[PDB]
Amino acid sequence: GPLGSVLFGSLRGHVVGLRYYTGVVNNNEMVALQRDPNNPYDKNAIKVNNVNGNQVGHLKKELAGALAYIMDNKLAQIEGVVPFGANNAFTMPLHMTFWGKEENRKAVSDQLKKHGFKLGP
DNA sequence: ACCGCCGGGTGCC
DNA sequence: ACCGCCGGGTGCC
């Protein structure tokens, strides 16, 4: 994880919107999360891009509705890997790891819990 | 029936 | 989408 950061934990979620983008992913490959704040459908949007810099999709809206605050306030840095399903039609799984400063670790977990998510090992 | 259930239309954010 | 969700059509046994 990033130099000087604590592992907060992990979450399994999904990339969606795959039919609308040309970015490809390989199984077991890293992806990049990027805030998408001017998306005209959802101000909390977070896009998922592949390592080369091509959009793959979006985080599911409910997860983005929890994570936008975390990204905007820089409470965690989030890493993503697609474990399998890279050629799925509609949705693919995403393993996310959350990293940051100890002083923000409970704030991140509390934000997630407010939206029905929880970190695990 | 102000219900539960069924199934057609539908589909990111 | 082989799903979840939405809402129109529907209705005892």
Q: Evaluate whether A84 touches A93 at the Cβ level (below 8 Å).
A: yes
**Cβ of A61 near strand B (distance < 7 A):** yes
**Cβ of A121 near strand B (distance < 7 A):** no
Which of A45, A53, A2 is CA-nearest to residue A25? A53
CA quadruple A114, A116, A119, A120: dihedral positive or negative? Answer: positive
Q: Evaluate whether A34 touches A67 at the Cβ level (below 8 Å).
A: no
Residue A113 tokens, joined: 């819990």
Distance CA A83, CA A38 (A): 29
Nearest nucleotide to A91 (CA to C1') is B12
State the residue for tokens 């306030």. A73
DSSP states of A63-86:
HHHHHHHHHHTT--EEEEEE-S-T
**In the structure, how far is the CA atom of residue A10 from the C1' atom of nucleotide B2, in angstroms?**
44
Local structure of A113: helix, strand or coil: helix
Supply the Cα-derived Rg of chain A in whole angstroms.
14
**In the structure, how far is the CA atom of residue A52 from the C1' atom of nucleotide B13, in angstroms?**
21
Domain spans in chain A, listed from the N-terminal domain onward: 1-121
Q: Evaluate whether A27 touches A82 at the Cβ level (below 8 Å).
A: yes
